[PDB]
Amino acid sequence: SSVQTAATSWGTVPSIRVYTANNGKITERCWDGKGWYTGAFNEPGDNVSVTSWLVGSAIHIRVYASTGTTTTEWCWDGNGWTKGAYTATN
Amino acid sequence: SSVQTAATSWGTVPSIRVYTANNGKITERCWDGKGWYTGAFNEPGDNVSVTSWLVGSAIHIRVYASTGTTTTEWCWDGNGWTKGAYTATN
Amino acid sequence: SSVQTAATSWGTVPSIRVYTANNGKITERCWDGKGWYTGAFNEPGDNVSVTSWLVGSAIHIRVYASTGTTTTEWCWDGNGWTKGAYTATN
């Protein structure tokens, strides 16, 4: 079994995002103040970390998904997840 | 062996909380500016993540404790840890 | 294989730091707005978490590196990494 999670939040309501790596797949659960719901993030990986920041009221999220020794960065900037420029030499 | 940790902080002093999952138990160490001490958080799990936010000067902490594929959310809102509404279908 | 990561960010640009535990070594990749580059952090461990805070414009980072059941705190306060006072009894 053994899932692994990562979490981030922003604002005062707040918004919360919880990422779960489970059996090689990372998924996302969301709270915007009233009920948990499933987010759009779906990417492969066995390990996840996350950070986020606001620019004014606009949220930006970066999820670091790793499989084996390879880490891929995924970016939310308000209109869909895209692959980020992150590289590492592991 | 193999412990796994998660950390959060708030303010400028700052306050720091470090959660350690060890042998199926999650515990908490605290810094409020002058010496580390043991916190009230004690919950079962093999994996931990955490996030926190301020509303004014009031801290709110959410700890995501997982055992197997089951994640439980624990909430600090200034007066004791309580189970949160988080659910996931892992 | 299996790397494990932790991430923190600050500001609005933003600055991002991603820590990777790989084969007992923790290293750091950095973003300050224009290109990823390798950071100064190099410490042993199989597990990593991180938190950070600003005092004005001055960033402070705490990395919690664990090997076996032993966690060491590493501190960035603008002029080099130093060992922190964190202790735990795992």
Ligand SMILES: OC[C@@]1(O)OC[C@@H](O)[C@@H](O)[C@@H]1O
């Ligand atoms: O409101 C939910 C949502 O749009 O929030 C921002 C990101 O977390 C997305 O993955 C997610 O679907």
Ligand SMILES: OC[C@@]1(O)OC[C@@H](O)[C@@H](O)[C@@H]1O
């Ligand atoms: O806009 C996307 C991007 O530039 O955001 C900042 C960093 O996360 C980069 O790796 C990433 O490609």
Ligand SMILES: OC[C@@]1(O)OC[C@@H](O)[C@@H](O)[C@@H]1O
């Ligand atoms: O001052 C310590 C404490 O009250 O801080 C808030 C939470 O981290 C609690 O678990 C913890 O006992």
Ligand SMILES: OC[C@@]1(O)OC[C@@H](O)[C@@H](O)[C@@H]1O
């Ligand atoms: O006050 C508790 C609560 O509503 O806080 C926001 C989220 O963490 C919820 O899952 C949780 O039940």
Ligand SMILES: OC[C@@]1(O)OC[C@@H](O)[C@@H](O)[C@@H]1O
């Ligand atoms: O600009 C990079 C750097 O100085 O940023 C602060 C810390 O992350 C250091 O380890 C790192 O080398």
Ligand SMILES: OC[C@@]1(O)OC[C@@H](O)[C@@H](O)[C@@H]1O
């Ligand atoms: O200046 C270093 C220090 O005092 O910063 C706050 C905490 O991280 C302590 O463990 C650490 O020794």
